[PDB]
Design an enzyme around this catalytic site. Structure first.
Site, PDB file in Angstrom:
ATOM      1  N   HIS A 109     -19.608 -12.001  -5.089  1.00  0.00           N
ATOM      2  CA  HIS A 109     -19.694 -12.083  -3.769  1.00  0.00           C
ATOM      3  C   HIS A 109     -21.113 -12.633  -3.114  1.00  0.00           C
ATOM      4  O   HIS A 109     -22.015 -12.466  -4.037  1.00  0.00           O
ATOM      5  CB  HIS A 109     -19.564 -10.688  -2.891  1.00  0.00           C
ATOM      6  CG  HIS A 109     -18.320 -10.033  -3.250  1.00  0.00           C
ATOM      7  ND1 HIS A 109     -18.028  -9.066  -4.300  1.00  0.00           N
ATOM      8  CD2 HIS A 109     -17.235 -10.075  -2.651  1.00  0.00           C
ATOM      9  CE1 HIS A 109     -16.742  -8.722  -4.280  1.00  0.00           C
ATOM     10  NE2 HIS A 109     -16.425  -9.191  -3.013  1.00  0.00           N
ATOM     11  N   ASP A 146     -23.795 -10.110  -3.252  1.00  0.00           N
ATOM     12  CA  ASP A 146     -24.111  -9.537  -4.245  1.00  0.00           C
ATOM     13  C   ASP A 146     -25.365 -10.407  -4.882  1.00  0.00           C
ATOM     14  O   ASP A 146     -26.351  -9.490  -5.428  1.00  0.00           O
ATOM     15  CB  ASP A 146     -23.086  -9.680  -5.680  1.00  0.00           C
ATOM     16  CG  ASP A 146     -21.745  -8.794  -5.351  1.00  0.00           C
ATOM     17  OD1 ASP A 146     -21.739  -7.715  -4.681  1.00  0.00           O
ATOM     18  OD2 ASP A 146     -20.771  -9.100  -5.941  1.00  0.00           O
ATOM     19  N   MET A 164     -15.332 -18.210 -10.652  1.00  0.00           N
ATOM     20  CA  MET A 164     -14.849 -17.953  -9.389  1.00  0.00           C
ATOM     21  C   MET A 164     -15.969 -17.262  -8.550  1.00  0.00           C
ATOM     22  O   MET A 164     -17.023 -16.845  -9.091  1.00  0.00           O
ATOM     23  CB  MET A 164     -13.655 -16.805  -9.410  1.00  0.00           C
ATOM     24  CG  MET A 164     -13.038 -16.242  -8.383  1.00  0.00           C
ATOM     25  SD  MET A 164     -13.928 -14.946  -7.558  1.00  0.00           S
ATOM     26  CE  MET A 164     -13.261 -13.425  -8.595  1.00  0.00           C
ATOM     27  N   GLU A 166      -6.074 -12.392  -2.260  1.00  0.00           N
ATOM     28  CA  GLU A 166      -6.080 -11.302  -3.126  1.00  0.00           C
ATOM     29  C   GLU A 166      -5.314 -10.275  -2.356  1.00  0.00           C
ATOM     30  O   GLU A 166      -5.837  -9.564  -1.243  1.00  0.00           O
ATOM     31  CB  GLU A 166      -7.477 -10.849  -3.524  1.00  0.00           C
ATOM     32  CG  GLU A 166      -7.579  -9.859  -4.364  1.00  0.00           C
ATOM     33  CD  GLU A 166      -8.462  -9.220  -4.893  1.00  0.00           C
ATOM     34  OE1 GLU A 166      -9.669 -10.009  -5.150  1.00  0.00           O
ATOM     35  OE2 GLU A 166      -8.620  -7.913  -4.980  1.00  0.00           O
ATOM     36  N   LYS A 175      -3.857  -6.354  -1.220  1.00  0.00           N
ATOM     37  CA  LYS A 175      -3.844  -4.976  -1.195  1.00  0.00           C
ATOM     38  C   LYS A 175      -3.234  -4.247  -0.152  1.00  0.00           C
ATOM     39  O   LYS A 175      -3.209  -4.858   0.833  1.00  0.00           O
ATOM     40  CB  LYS A 175      -5.544  -4.691  -1.186  1.00  0.00           C
ATOM     41  CG  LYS A 175      -5.871  -3.230  -1.742  1.00  0.00           C
ATOM     42  CD  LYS A 175      -7.534  -2.844  -1.439  1.00  0.00           C
ATOM     43  CE  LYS A 175      -7.568  -1.597  -1.904  1.00  0.00           C
ATOM     44  NZ  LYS A 175      -9.150  -1.102  -1.993  1.00  0.00           N
ATOM     45  N   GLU A 234      -3.906  -8.130  -8.239  1.00  0.00           N
ATOM     46  CA  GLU A 234      -4.831  -6.992  -8.958  1.00  0.00           C
ATOM     47  C   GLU A 234      -3.714  -5.823  -9.309  1.00  0.00           C
ATOM     48  O   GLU A 234      -3.013  -5.302  -8.792  1.00  0.00           O
ATOM     49  CB  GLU A 234      -6.092  -6.423  -8.196  1.00  0.00           C
ATOM     50  CG  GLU A 234      -6.669  -5.294  -8.937  1.00  0.00           C
ATOM     51  CD  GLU A 234      -7.778  -4.826  -8.171  1.00  0.00           C
ATOM     52  OE1 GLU A 234      -8.944  -5.494  -8.056  1.00  0.00           O
ATOM     53  OE2 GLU A 234      -7.787  -3.469  -8.020  1.00  0.00           O
ATOM     54  N   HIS A 283      -3.843  -2.882  -7.233  1.00  0.00           N
ATOM     55  CA  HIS A 283      -3.187  -2.761  -5.900  1.00  0.00           C
ATOM     56  C   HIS A 283      -1.889  -3.000  -5.583  1.00  0.00           C
ATOM     57  O   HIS A 283      -1.160  -2.184  -4.645  1.00  0.00           O
ATOM     58  CB  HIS A 283      -3.675  -4.214  -5.228  1.00  0.00           C
ATOM     59  CG  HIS A 283      -5.267  -4.134  -5.173  1.00  0.00           C
ATOM     60  ND1 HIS A 283      -5.921  -5.258  -4.636  1.00  0.00           N
ATOM     61  CD2 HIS A 283      -6.240  -3.135  -5.201  1.00  0.00           C
ATOM     62  CE1 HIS A 283      -7.035  -5.021  -4.452  1.00  0.00           C
ATOM     63  NE2 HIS A 283      -7.422  -3.714  -5.095  1.00  0.00           N
ATOM     64  N   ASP A 333      -6.874 -10.078 -11.436  1.00  0.00           N
ATOM     65  CA  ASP A 333      -7.843  -9.016 -11.569  1.00  0.00           C
ATOM     66  C   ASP A 333      -7.094  -8.022 -12.378  1.00  0.00           C
ATOM     67  O   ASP A 333      -6.167  -7.214 -11.931  1.00  0.00           O
ATOM     68  CB  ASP A 333      -8.242  -8.541 -10.303  1.00  0.00           C
ATOM     69  CG  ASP A 333      -9.293  -9.413  -9.383  1.00  0.00           C
ATOM     70  OD1 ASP A 333      -9.923 -10.302 -10.346  1.00  0.00           O
ATOM     71  OD2 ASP A 333      -9.602  -9.007  -8.355  1.00  0.00           O
ATOM     72  N   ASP A 381      -7.837   3.706  -4.046  1.00  0.00           N
ATOM     73  CA  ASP A 381      -8.012   2.482  -5.346  1.00  0.00           C
ATOM     74  C   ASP A 381      -9.202   2.952  -6.314  1.00  0.00           C
ATOM     75  O   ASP A 381     -10.267   3.259  -6.144  1.00  0.00           O
ATOM     76  CB  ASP A 381      -8.438   1.555  -4.282  1.00  0.00           C
ATOM     77  CG  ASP A 381      -8.486   0.270  -5.149  1.00  0.00           C
ATOM     78  OD1 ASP A 381      -7.736   0.090  -6.055  1.00  0.00           O
ATOM     79  OD2 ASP A 381      -9.576  -0.350  -4.649  1.00  0.00           O
ATOM     80  N   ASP A 437      -9.706   1.574  -9.531  1.00  0.00           N
ATOM     81  CA  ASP A 437     -10.369   0.667 -10.294  1.00  0.00           C
ATOM     82  C   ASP A 437     -10.967   1.062 -11.745  1.00  0.00           C
ATOM     83  O   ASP A 437     -12.068   0.882 -11.966  1.00  0.00           O
ATOM     84  CB  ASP A 437     -11.691   0.222  -9.671  1.00  0.00           C
ATOM     85  CG  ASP A 437     -11.077  -0.806  -8.349  1.00  0.00           C
ATOM     86  OD1 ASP A 437     -10.007  -1.183  -8.303  1.00  0.00           O
ATOM     87  OD2 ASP A 437     -12.077  -1.085  -7.421  1.00  0.00           O
ATOM     88  N   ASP A 453     -11.661  -6.474 -12.475  1.00  0.00           N
ATOM     89  CA  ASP A 453     -12.506  -6.092 -11.375  1.00  0.00           C
ATOM     90  C   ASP A 453     -12.266  -4.513 -11.396  1.00  0.00           C
ATOM     91  O   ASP A 453     -11.249  -3.964 -10.948  1.00  0.00           O
ATOM     92  CB  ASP A 453     -11.768  -6.478  -9.941  1.00  0.00           C
ATOM     93  CG  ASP A 453     -12.452  -5.894  -8.802  1.00  0.00           C
ATOM     94  OD1 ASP A 453     -13.443  -5.399  -8.778  1.00  0.00           O
ATOM     95  OD2 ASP A 453     -11.833  -6.288  -7.705  1.00  0.00           O
TER      96      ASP A 453
END
Ligand SMILES: O=C[C@H](O)[C@@H](O)[C@H](O)[C@H](O)CO
Ligand SMILES: O=C[C@H](O)[C@@H](O)[C@H](O)[C@H](O)CO
Ligand SMILES: O=C[C@H](O)[C@@H](O)[C@H](O)[C@H](O)CO
Ligand SMILES: O=C[C@H](O)[C@@H](O)[C@H](O)[C@H](O)CO
Ligand SMILES: [Mg+2]
Ligand SMILES: [Mg+2]
Ligand SMILES: [Mg+2]
Ligand SMILES: [Mg+2]
Ligand SMILES: [Mg+2]
Ligand SMILES: [Mg+2]
Ligand SMILES: [Mg+2]
Ligand SMILES: [Mg+2]
Lengths: 386, 386, 386, 386
Positions: A53, A56, A87, A180, A182, A216, A219, A244, A254, A256, A286
C-alpha cells in the site's frame, strides 16, 4: 519436498509480516519492520515478490524529499535481491479522513482527494513493475440504512473506477485493476460484498476489460460461501486477475490466518482448481501472523503459508493423477457433465421423445451418483493415506 | 389504515399457504389445499394474484387428460375472482430424478428432461398471463468438491438458459426470466449463491436483456448479507424483475417466516427502497406458515405479510416526508453524494491543488457525519414515536 | 491399514445409513432399510453396535403383537452377529402431535404423552442392554417470542427429567441420561442450544449425577463454536457420557456429513482430545449418507466414517509422540499452564513483590508464544508431511 | 415522552462514549474524553451511573501519586452529580503482556500478575461503592488447537476465580462477580463462549453463590443464539447479576451498536423479559458510538440507547396489558404451560390410560397453536399499530 522456488510465484504484502499486532482490544506486540529488511528476509524464504500500500512504503504525510528517500531505499533492496513487485494498492482506510469511505464518501472533496492519492500511487506502481493494481474499498459502506443511498454510491463508485480507467488509458500504462471484495469489517456492511457482486459491477464500467477481481479466501468465508466455487466463477468469467490466500475459521471477524489454516479441505480444493485451470498470476498471501508471536514466529508463519500450498499442490496432483480417481470420476459422470445438453438446438430437443415422453424418470432417479466414494478417495489423497 | 388493495400488487405462491408442514424431522401437520380454494381465499384477503410451480397445479405424472382438468378448474377460479397470474416457475427439485440438479445434473439425459419439463410450463404460464418466469436452481450444486466441476456446470447452466431464451424468442413470447439465488439448502452449496453471482452470470448469456433476478429476503440473509443493499445493486443494474418477501432470523436453515418477522429494520429499509425507487413489479410472498398452525393460522400469517408491508410503507413514507429528516440528510451530506466527483474529467482533477496539495485533510477528518442522529430519527419513525 | 474391528467401539443409529433421503425440498431417493439387514451389514463393516429411536424399530402405532414381533427379529439379528445396543432414544419430533414440543409442549396432555412414550422405550432399552439413554429435544423451542415463556418451559423441562430420574431409580435401572444440544432446526431456536446450556441445566436437576451430555460435532458448529473446546469443558465437568460424530461445513442447515468431512482440522483436534483424555464410550456416528447416493454409496459413506476416525487417531498419536512436538510444547509453555498459579495461596501472592510491584511487564510482553511453529508441526502430522 | 431519569438505572462504561474510534483498519477519529467530563455529560442526559476498567480511570503505569490524583478528581465529579458506580472491572486484554490471556496465560508469572492487577482494582471498586465486579476474559482462548490445553486452562480459570472469592470473603467485602461471555474476538475462540458455558462453569467454583453472569446482547448474537432465551435461562438459574445492552446485526465482528439497533425484535422481547421478571440491576450500555461520529454524535448515540429502552418498555407493557393479547395467550395455551405435567407423580402418570393407551393423538395433533396471530399482535404493539 517442500521448498519455495521463484516459479511458484509466492508473494507477500509489506503489511502482512509487518503487522505489529494491534487489534480492536489491544496494542501492538511487535515493533514496526523496515521494508528493506522485509524484502531481504522474504527473498531468503523463497518468495518471488512483495506488494505494498502506498502508506506502507511512504509514511502518510511525508514531504516529497522524504518520499523519494523511502522509494530509493526500497528499490535498492529489490534490485539487490531480484525481488519483483507484481501488485500495489492504495490505503484508503486507515486515516480518519476516510471514515465514511474514499470513492463513495458522502463529502465530495474526500472523494476527489481519494482519487488523487490513488493516481499518485498508480504512477509509482507502474515504474516498479506492477501489472495489477488492487482496490479494497474497506470503508465504502455503512452501519445504518439512511447513511448511504447505495444506488447513488454505486454511481460514485462507477465514476471513480471509470476516471481511473481513463487515466491509465491516456498514459498508455499496462496496469489492470482488481477489485477486492469483503462483506463487512470495518464497516457494518461493505459495498460489493462478494466476488459475485464485484463481477457484476465490472460489467457496468466503461472499460470492463481493464478490471477483474482479487478474491480473498477468508472474505468469502465470512459470508459462509464456498471459496473454490466463487473462484471457478471468476475463472469462468475470465476475471481472476489476482488472488489473496490465507485462512479463516468460520463466520466471525476477519482473522487472516496463514494459508492452510482455517478450512483445510477448501484450501485443498482451491489449489486443485488453481493448478488444474492453469492460473498464472501471483500466489499472494494476505495474512497476519497472530499477535502472540515474536519476529521468529512471524517468519515461521510466512514460511508455513508457502509450505502448505506446496503440500496441497502435491496432494491434489496425486488425486487427479490416480487411475482409481479417474475411474471414480467416470462413475460419477463428470465426463458427461462436459457433454453439451442439446448441441442440435432446441427444436431437436423439442422433437426428441426420449427427452420427455419416453424418458424413464425412475430408472434415472435410481442411478446412484457415487459421490461419497469419490470424496473419500479425495480425503485419502489429502491425508496421504493413498 | 392497513387493508390490502389490488394496486398493492400482493401475490402469493400456491405452495406458501399450501405448505403442509413437512420438514426434515417431521411429517405434515396440515392437509393439502385445493388450488381453487387458495385462489378464492387469497382473493378474499385482498391479494392481487397467485403464482405456481407446475407440480403445484398438475400432479407429477398426470396424464394429459388429468392435466387439463386441473388447468381448467384453476382457470375457472381465476376468471371468477379476477385473480391474476404474474409469475410461474418449474419444480426442478422435489422428484428424486433431480437429486443432482436439473440444468447442471451430471447425467445428460436428466438435463434434457429438465429443459423439456420447463418449456412445457413456459407455454402454460404464457397463456395464463405470466410475464415473469422464475428459475430457482435449488438442486444445482454439491456437498463435495470433486462431485461438480463448477466451470463446466456454469457452461451447462449458460447453455440451458440460452436454449430457453431461444425458445421464447422463436415463439414470440413476451416472458422474461428471473433467476432466484440461494446460497445453500438443499445442497451443501448452491451455484449462483447470491444476487451478485446471479447478476454477473446474466451478463455472460446470449440474450442478457431477457434475464434479471428474483432475490429473496431470507436467502441473502442466510449469507449474512444486507438485503436492501443487494436490492439497490439489482435496481442499479436494471435487473429487479421480481422479488420474494419473507423473514429470516439469522444465518441458519431457511425459515421463510412471514414478511416483517425476522429482521424488522431490514424489512423497513427494503420497503423504503422499493417504494422510493418506484419498483412496480409484484410484491410476492414466498413464506411458509409455521407447522404449529392450523388453516386459520395459515390465513392469519398470509394476512400479516400484507399488513406488515403496509405499516412499513406508511412509516417509511413519513420518515422521508419529515422536514427534520430532510434536514438531517443534508447534515449527513446525502445531497453531496449525488454530486459527480469530477465531472470535468481527470485532467481538471489532476490540476486541482485543492484536491490534494492544498487539501486540509484534518479539517475534513474532523467533520462529524451525524449518522446516529439520522438513524435515531428513522428508529423513531418506524416505532411511531414520531 | 485402517480396518475397524468391534474393539474400536464404532456405533451407528438405525436412522443414519437408514436415511431415505427425504429433505425439506425433496422426496425419498432410497427405499427403507430393514433393521435386520442394517445390523448385519454394519457387523460386516466392523461396527461394534447400533442405536435406535423407538419409532426406527417399531413403527408408530404398532399393536403390541406387531411391536413384540419387531423386537424379536431385531434381537435375533443382534444375537447372531454379536452386535451390541449401547444407547437408545425416543422419537419426540416426527409425529404432528409433537409440533410444539414433547416435554415442553404448551398442551399438558401432550407433555404427559411424551413422558409415557419415553418411559416405555427406557424399559425396552434396558432389556436390550443400553447403558445411555439420549434425549434430543428438537421440538422444544419457538419461532416467535410470546409462544413459549422460557422460564416456565425450563420448569417443565426440569420436571420431565426429574420424573424420568425418579422412574429409573425406583426401578433400580443402571442407565444414565445424556442430553443432546442443538441451537436450531427444526424450531427457530431450540431450548438448551449448546453444550454449555445443557451442562448448566443439569446442575439444577434433582439427581444431577444421572445426567450428562451427548454433544454432536455439527450442532455446536451451527453456532460457530469450537467443538473440541466444548468437549474439553464437558470432560472437565465429568459429563461426557456419549458423543455424536459427523461433519458440518459451517453455519447453515444441519448437514450430518460423514465424520472427517466438513471441518477436518476440528475433527483432528477432536480425536486428539478423545484419545488423550481416555474417553471410553462409543464413538457413535450420527450422519446422513447424501440423498445423491444409492445403497452402495450408503455403505461407502458409513465405512468412511470409521476410516477417517482411524486415520486421524494415528496422526494425532504420531503428533503427540514426536520429540520435536514435545520440545515445541515446552517452548510454548504448555508445561507452565499445568503449574498452579498461586498454590502458595492468596496472602503469599499479595506479599509477592515479583508478582506485581517488581514484575517486568515488558520483558514478559516481549516473549513470543511460538504457537505458529507448533501449529505447523500439527499441520505436517495431519497431512503426513512427517 | 421518553426522558430518562436516574430512577431508570441506566449506566454507561467510561470506555463506551469515551471510545476514540480506533479499529483494526483505522486510527482514532475522536480525542480522548476526560472521565470528569463524561460523568457530568452523562448526568445531564439522565444516566444513573458510570462503570470503569482500572485502565480507563488510571492510565497504565501511573505512579501512586498520579493514581490517587485521578481517583480524587473522579470521586469529586461523582459527589457533585449524585452519579453512582454500580460496577467495575479490570482491563486484562489491552497490554501486550496479556496477549495469551490473563488468568489462563501459559506463562505462570503473567497469571500471578493478572490476579494482582485485578485484586488492586477490587479494593478500589468497593471504595467507590460497586456491588458487581465483572470479568470479561477476552484474551483467554486460542487461534490454534495445541496452543491451549482447555481442560488445564479451565483448572487455571477455576483457580483464579476461587482465589478472588477467597480474597473478598477474607476481607468481608459485599461485592459479587459476574462473568461476561463472548464466543470469539480478539481470540479465535474464547473460553466460556456463551451464557450457558459460563453458567455451567460457575457450578464448579468453590463458592458458586458469589458468581453470576453479565451477558451482552451482541455476544450471544455473534453465535446466532437467541439472547432473550439465554437471559431467561440465567434468570431461571438466579444468576443474572448484571446485563450489557447494545445492538449487533448478525454473525460478524463485534459491533457494539447503540441499544435498539441491530435486531430490534430481540430488543423488544428482551425488555419484555427484564421488565416482566422484575430484574432490578443496572441497565448498562456497553456500546461504541460509530467512528463516523463527532462528540455531538457520541452524546446523540448515548441518548438513543436510553430512549430506545424506554420506548420498548412502553410497547412491551402495552402488549401484555391488552385483553386481546391476554385472550390470544390463552388460545395458544401459555396458561397450560404453567400447569405441572404430572404433579400427581410418576406411578399415577403410569396408571393414567388417558396419558397413553387412550390418548387421541390425532385430535391433539390437529389443534393449531395460534402462534402467528399472537406474534402479529406483538408486531402491531411494537410498531404502535395499536
Ligand atoms: O481485510 C482487509 C483487506 O483484505 C486488506 O488487507 C486489503 O487486502 C489491502 O487493503 C490491499 O487490497
Ligand atoms: O428456498 C426455496 C426457494 O425459494 C423456492 O421456494 C422457490 O421460491 C421456488 O422454487 C420458486 O422459485
Ligand atoms: O439433528 C438432530 C439430532 O441429531 C437427532 O437426529 C438426534 O441425534 C436423535 O433424535 C437421537 O439422538
Ligand atoms: O466485547 C468486549 C467486552 O464487551 C468488553 O469491552 C467488556 O465489556 C469489558 O472488558 C468490561 O465489561
Ligand atoms: Mg482479511
Ligand atoms: Mg486481501
Ligand atoms: Mg427460503
Ligand atoms: Mg423464493
Ligand atoms: Mg445434526
Ligand atoms: Mg445427534
Ligand atoms: Mg461486544
Ligand atoms: Mg460487555
Amino acid at each position: 519436498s517442500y521448498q519455495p522456488t521463484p516459479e511458484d510465484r509466492f508473494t507477500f504484502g509489506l503489511w502482512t509480516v509487518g503487522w505489529q499486532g494491534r487489534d480492536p482490544f489491544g496494542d501492538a506486540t511487535r515493533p514496526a519492520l523496515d521494508p528493506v529488511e522485509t524484502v531481504q528476509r522474504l527473498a531468503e524464504l523463497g518468495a518471488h515478490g512483495v506488494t505494498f500500500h502506498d502508506d506502507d512504503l511512504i509514511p502518510f504525510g511525508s514531504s516529497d524529499t522524504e518520499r523519494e528517500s523511502h522509494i530509493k531505499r526500497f528499490r535498492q533492496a529489490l534490485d539487490a535481491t531480484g525481488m519483483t513487485v507484481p501488485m500495489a494498492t492504495t490505503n484508503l482506510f486507515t486515516h480518519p479522513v476516510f471514515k465514511d469511505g474514499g470513492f463513495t464518501a458522502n463529502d465530495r472533496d474526500v472523494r476527489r482527494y481519494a482519487l488523487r492519492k490513488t493516481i499518485r500511487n498508480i504512477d509509482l506502481a507502474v515504474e516498479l513493475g506492477a501489472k495489477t493494481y488492487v482496490a479494497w474499498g474497506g470503508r465504502e459502506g455503512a452501519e445504518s440504512g439512511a447513511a448511504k443511498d447505495v444506488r447513488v454510491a454505486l454511481d460514485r463508485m462507477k465514476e471513480a473506477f471509470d476516471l481511473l480507467g481513463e487515466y491509465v488509458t491516456s498514459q498508455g500504462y499496462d496496469t489492470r485493476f482488481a477489485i477486492e471484495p469483503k462483506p463487512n469489517e470495518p464497516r457494518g456492511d461493505i459495498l460489493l460484498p462478494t466476488v459475485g457482486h464485484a463481477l457484476a459491477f465490472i460489467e457496468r464500467l466503461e472499460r470492463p476489460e481493464l478490471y477483474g477481481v482479487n478474491p480473498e479466501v477468508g472474505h468469502e468465508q465470512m459470508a459462509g460461501l464456498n471459496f473454490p466455487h466463487g473462484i471457478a466463477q471468476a475463472l469462468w468469467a475470465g476475471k481472476l486477475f489476482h488472488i489473496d490466500l490465507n485462512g479463516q475459521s468460520g463466520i466471525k471477524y476477519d482473522q487472516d490466518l496463514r494459508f492452510g489454516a482455517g478450512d483445510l479441505r477448501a484450501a485443498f480444493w482451491l489449489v486443485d482448481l488453481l493448478e488444474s485451470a492453469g492460473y498464472e498470476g501471483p500466489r499472494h498471501f494476505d495474512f497476519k501472523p497472530p499477535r502472540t508471536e515474536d519476529i521468529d514466529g512471524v517468519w515461521a508463519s510466512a514460511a508455513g503459508c508457502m509450505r502448505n500450498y506446496l503440500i496441497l499442490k502435491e496432494r491434489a496432483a496425486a488425486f487427479r493423477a490416480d487411475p482409481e480417481v479417474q475411474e471414480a470420476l467416470r462413475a460419477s459422470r463428470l465426463d458427461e457433465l462436459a457433454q453439451p445438453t442439446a448441441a442440435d438446438g432446441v427444436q431437436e430437443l423439442l422433437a426428441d421423445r426420449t427427452a420427455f415422453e419416453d424418458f424413464d424418470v425412475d430408472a434415472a432417479a435410481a442411478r446412484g451418483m457415487a459421490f461419497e466414494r469419490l470424496d473419500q478417495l479425495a480425503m485419502d489423497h489429502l491425508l496421504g493415506a493413498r
